[PDB]
Each structure stands twice: as C-alpha cells, then as structure tokens.
C-alpha cells in the first residue's frame, strides 16, 4: 500500500490521492512506501523555500509513526527508478 | 520590532532591516587610526582619510581577530549606518564556516552585555546564501575578500566534517594583479594604488574557458587588450592580465600556494559526502561572493566539474545575479520567516544560560 500528502502553503498536511497526475512543480509531496520501508519527500522544481523547509519538518514527524523506514529527500526531474515505478 | 541583518565580511559589512530587497549599507570593514601620538574612524571615514591614518581590518580571512575594533564596527553599524539603538533590535549575524566556537560565544556575548539586543541569532555565510537561491540542499562556493569555502548543505544543514577553506579570494587577487602588472612597467604599491587595482581587477578581468589557448593566442587576439582610465585621467592597458589574475582561483601555484584549485576543492568536498548526496550536490552548486563575479567562471567551473564527476552525473552551476549580497538578502529571507521566530535567542535565554546558549539553538 502506498498513501500520499500535500504541505500546502499555509503549512497545513493534507491527504491527496497517490498517482501519477499529483506531481507538480509546486509542490513538496510525501508519499509512504510500506513495502519498502521508505518515505519519499518529493519537491517540485519550483518549490518555494518555506515549502521544502516544512516539508522536511512533516516527513520527520510522519517518520515517528515508522522509526525505522527510510527517509529519501527527492528531486522533480532526478527521482529514482523506484519511485517513478511507484506511481506509474 | 524590526530585525536587523549584518554580514561581516573580512572587507565589506552589509547590513540591512530584515524584509529589505537588499543591504541598506555597504562598507569597509575597516577601523583606521592617526599615526601620531601612537582616537578613530570606522568604515567609510576611514577611507575618507585613508592618508592619514593606519588602516586595521578586524576580520581577518572571515575569522573576527580584532574585538575591541570589531565592538566599533559594530557600534558604528548599529548608529551611524542604520540609525538605530541596537537594544530595539533583534540582530541576526553571519560568521564563517568553522567558526570557532569560543568567537560564536563572544559575540554573542557582546551583543547581549555590551549591545544590549533583545534577540539575536548567528548563521553560517554559505548557508544563507543556499536559502537565498531557493535550496535547502546544495554545494555553494562562497569566495568574498579574505577566505573562499566549499560548503555542503543537506535539507537545511551544512556538513562540517566535508567543508573546505582556502586562504585565496580577492584582496589576494588584487595583490596579484598588481604584481604581474609590472610586466608592462606599471608600478602600484601604495593602499590608494592598490585600491585602484581592485577596481581594475572588478572591471576588466574574466576567467577563460582555456586558460592555455587563451595564453597562446594573447599575441594574435585583436580584443583581448583593454584601456583603463585612472582617476587623474591617465590610462593604462592590459592584455593577458585579465584573466591570469582570476586563473590564480583554479591554479594556486600562481601566488605559491599548492592548495587545489576551487574547482578541485569542490570536487573533494562532495568526495567527502555519502554517496547518496552527490547527485544532489553536482546538480546544485551555488556561487556566492564577489569573487565569484567574474565573467565567465561559471561556464569554466561547469568545465572543471564535468572533467572530474562521473560521465552521466547532471551537473549545473548557479551563479545568482546578486550573489554579491545573496548572504544577506538569505538572512533578510530567514529572519522573516514566521517559523524563524522561535529560534531567536533571547535576552532571557542568555541570562539563564550564557553565552554557552547559541550552541544550542544556532
Ligand atoms: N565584479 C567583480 N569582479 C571581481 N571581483 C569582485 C567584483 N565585485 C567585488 N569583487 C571582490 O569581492 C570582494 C568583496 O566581496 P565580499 O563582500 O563577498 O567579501 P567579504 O564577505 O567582505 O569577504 P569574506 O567573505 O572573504 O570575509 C573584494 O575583493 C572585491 O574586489
Ligand atoms: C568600494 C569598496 C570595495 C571593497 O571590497 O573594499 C574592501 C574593503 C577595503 C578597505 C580599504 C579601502 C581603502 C576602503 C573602502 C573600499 C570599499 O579593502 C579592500 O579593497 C581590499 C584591499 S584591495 C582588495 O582587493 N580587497 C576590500
Ligand atoms: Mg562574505
């Protein structure tokens, strides 16, 4: 299973649906991948500053629910092979 | 209840209001004193007198050396320069990478017991200038007027064990500019002269792609050759001086130091970092500093960079428009962000803990 969050721009976590469409340049995603044990923050290109500071601060508090689950900060543009399989 | 934002560079400060587009002042870091006798002026009437007095420059290869003159420079920033009582102001500073940790106590020191600041927060130069560019993961190249850092950044943090300082930026460049100027029978010696140099340096110097074929075909070049006028109108022309001064960044043997160049620095800085980071890294290198300025350094740090990481790593230099200030225009950006406001240090905190308190929160 797979879920999928949005750190919005008034810093609030938000669910949103884990697939191919969600990714934007906007945007800083987390997506939770419990068969590999990893936590995926995505940042998009044009991700402002305040957005990818707090969305290291949500993929830290989400990694308290799964101590021991990876974290891998990603990039638009450079993700790896694992994740692009993840959502298409 | 506005926050101020000063940068101690080892030649300029820029000080500013935390939420200005850019650095209010911009000045010497300098305190000069009359020879005779064996009282003083800082920052620009320093200069304005530059004849008469001893120039002393408390900041010493980005490292503070001098406190009781860098109590003046900052007395002088905070009254002269800004017009304002520093006990009204949160202050954010700026120090060097590797900053040792006793300087980090005594400043802060000082602006609690002698500045009296309600609040106060250091950060590290390459740091803001990474949050300046819009990162918060990246390598900057931050070269000013005394030192030159490689600095690894990883979700917000600096990694210490893998930064690199090189005692090569511009006041060694001008010293060298005007050594080979010589060559061409120009003689500048003098503190004016030598000023007169840096400008020469800012204005007609570049970094070649091909530093050998730019050397060997110097002779045949028709544009290579610039005039320069002085300021009591005469002119002079250089030719293969304007990019063998700025060379001296990626060969050091050109001033006798065997340290790597700065593109090797960065090389072996990422060499330092996890494997896992490098990508980030390479596809992130951000200059800051006004020796970065020269034209064409980016295009032949691309060069470099490329020749030494992996054939399929995406590599890509940043090189901002106002990477001159972009370490104060990032401390103007962090002390205004909301969430910045719990990580001032207070007055009470100091009182409570002492100057031991900004390992804690800075
Ligand atoms: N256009 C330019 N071309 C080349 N060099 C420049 C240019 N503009 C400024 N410089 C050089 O940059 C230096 C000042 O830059 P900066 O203010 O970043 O240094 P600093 O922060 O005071 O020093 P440091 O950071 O090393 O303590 C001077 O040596 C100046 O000659
Ligand atoms: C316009 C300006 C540029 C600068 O970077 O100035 C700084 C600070 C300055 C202090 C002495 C000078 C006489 C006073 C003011 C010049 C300030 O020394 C510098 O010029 C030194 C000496 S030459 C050089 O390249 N760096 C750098
Ligand atoms: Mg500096």
Same mark, same amino acid.
């Given at each position: 299973?797979?879920?999928?969050?949005?750190?919005?721009?008034?810093?609030?976590?938000?669910?949103?649906?884990?697939?191919?469409?969600?990714? !934007?340049?906007?945007?800083?995603?987390?997506?939770? !991948?419990? !068969?590999?044990?990893?936590?995926?923050?995505?940042?998009?290109?044009?991700?402002?500053?305040?957005?990818?500071?707090?969305?290291?601060?949500?993929?830290?508090?989400?990694?308290?629910?799964?101590?021991?689950?990876?974290?891998?900060?990603?990039?638009?543009?450079?993700?790896?092979?694992?994740?692009? !399989?993840?959502?298409? | 209840?506005?926050?101020?934002?000063?940068?101690?560079?080892?030649?300029?400060?820029?000080?500013?209001?935390?939420?200005?587009?850019?650095?209010?002042?911009?000045?010497?870091?300098?305190?000069?004193?009359?020879?005779?006798?064996?009282?003083?002026?800082?920052?620009?009437?320093?200069?304005?007198?530059?004849?008469?007095?001893?120039?002393?420059?408390?900041?010493?290869?980005?490292?503070?050396?001098?406190?009781?003159?860098?109590?003046?420079?900052?007395?002088?920033?905070?009254?002269?320069?800004?017009?304002?009582?520093?006990?009204?102001?949160?202050?954010?500073?700026?120090?060097?990478?590797?900053?040792?940790?006793?300087?980090?106590?005594?400043?802060?020191?000082?602006?609690?017991?002698?500045?009296?600041?309600?609040?106060?927060?250091?950060?590290?130069?390459?740091?803001?200038?990474?949050?300046?560019?819009?990162?918060?993961?990246?390598?900057?190249?931050?070269?000013?007027?005394?030192?030159?850092?490689?600095?690894?950044?990883?979700?917000?943090?600096?990694?210490?064990?893998?930064?690199?300082?090189?005692?090569?930026?511009?006041?060694?460049?001008?010293?060298?500019?005007?050594?080979?100027?010589?060559?061409?029978?120009?003689?500048?010696?003098?503190?004016?002269?030598?000023?007169?140099?840096?400008?020469?340096?800012?204005?007609?110097?570049?970094?070649?792609?091909?530093?050998?074929?730019?050397?060997?075909?110097?002779?045949?070049?028709?544009?290579?050759?610039?005039?320069?006028?002085?300021?009591?109108?005469?002119?002079?022309?250089?030719?293969?001086?304007?990019?063998?001064?700025?060379?001296?960044?990626?060969?050091?043997?050109?001033?006798?130091?065997?340290?790597?160049?700065?593109?090797?620095?960065?090389?072996?800085?990422?060499?330092?970092?996890?494997?896992?980071?490098?990508?980030?890294?390479?596809?992130?290198?951000?200059?800051?500093?006004?020796?970065?300025?020269?034209?064409?350094?980016?295009?032949?740090?691309?060069?470099?960079?490329?020749?030494?990481?992996?054939?399929?790593?995406?590599?890509?230099?940043?090189?901002?428009?106002?990477?001159?200030?972009?370490?104060?225009?990032?401390?103007?950006?962090?002390?205004?962000?909301?969430?910045?406001?719990?990580?001032?240090?207070?007055?009470?905190?100091?009182?409570?803990?002492?100057?031991?308190?900004?390992?804690?929160?800075?």
């Amino acid at each position: 299973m797979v879920e999928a969050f949005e750190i919005d721009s008034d810093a609030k976590l938000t669910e949103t649906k884990a697939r191919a469409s969600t990714i !934007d340049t906007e945007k800083v995603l987390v997506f939770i !991948d419990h !068969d590999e044990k990893t936590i995926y923050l995505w940042r998009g290109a044009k991700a402002e500053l305040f957005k990818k500071l707090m969305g290291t601060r949500v993929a830290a508090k989400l990694s308290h629910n799964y101590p021991k689950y990876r974290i891998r900060p990603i990039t638009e543009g450079s993700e790896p092979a694992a994740f692009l !399989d993840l959502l298409g | 209840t506005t926050a101020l934002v000063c940068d101690n560079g080892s030649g300029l400060v820029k000080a500013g209001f935390a939420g200005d587009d850019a650095p209010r002042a911009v000045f010497p870091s300098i305190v000069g004193r009359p020879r005779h006798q064996g009282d003083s002026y800082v920052g620009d009437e320093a200069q304005s007198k530059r004849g008469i007095l001893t120039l002393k420059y408390p900041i010493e290869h980005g490292i503070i050396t001098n406190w009781d003159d860098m109590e003046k420079i900052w007395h002088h920033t905070f009254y002269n320069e800004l017009r304002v009582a520093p006990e009204e102001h949160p202050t954010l500073l700026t120090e060097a990478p590797l900053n040792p940790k006793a300087n980090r106590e005594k400043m802060t020191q000082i602006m609690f017991e002698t500045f009296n600041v309600p609040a106060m927060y250091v950060a590290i130069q390459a740091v803001l200038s990474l949050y300046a560019s819009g990162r918060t993961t990246g390598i900057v190249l931050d070269s000013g007027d005394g030192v030159t850092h490689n600095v690894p950044i990883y979700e917000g943090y600096a990694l210490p064990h893998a930064i690199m300082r090189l005692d090569l930026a511009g006041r060694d460049l001008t010293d060298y500019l005007m050594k080979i100027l010589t060559e061409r029978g120009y003689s500048f010696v003098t503190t004016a002269e030598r000023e007169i140099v840096r400008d020469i340096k800012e204005k007609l110097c570049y970094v070649a792609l091909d530093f050998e074929n730019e050397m060997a075909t110097a002779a045949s070049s028709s544009s290579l050759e610039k005039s320069y006028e002085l300021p009591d109108g005469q002119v002079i022309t250089i030719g293969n001086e304007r990019f063998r001064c700025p060379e001296t960044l990626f060969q050091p043997s050109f001033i006798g130091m065997e340290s790597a160049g700065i593109h090797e620095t960065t090389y072996n800085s990422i060499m330092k970092c996890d494997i896992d980071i490098r990508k980030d890294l390479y596809a992130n290198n951000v200059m800051s500093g006004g020796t970065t300025m020269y034209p064409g350094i980016a295009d032949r740090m691309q060069k470099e960079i490329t020749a030494l990481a992996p054939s399929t790593m995406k590599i890509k230099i940043i090189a901002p428009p106002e990477r001159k200030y972009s370490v104060w225009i990032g401390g103007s950006i962090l002390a205004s962000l909301s969430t910045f406001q719990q990580m001032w240090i207070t007055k009470q905190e100091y009182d409570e803990a002492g100057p031991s308190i900004v390992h804690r929160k800075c």
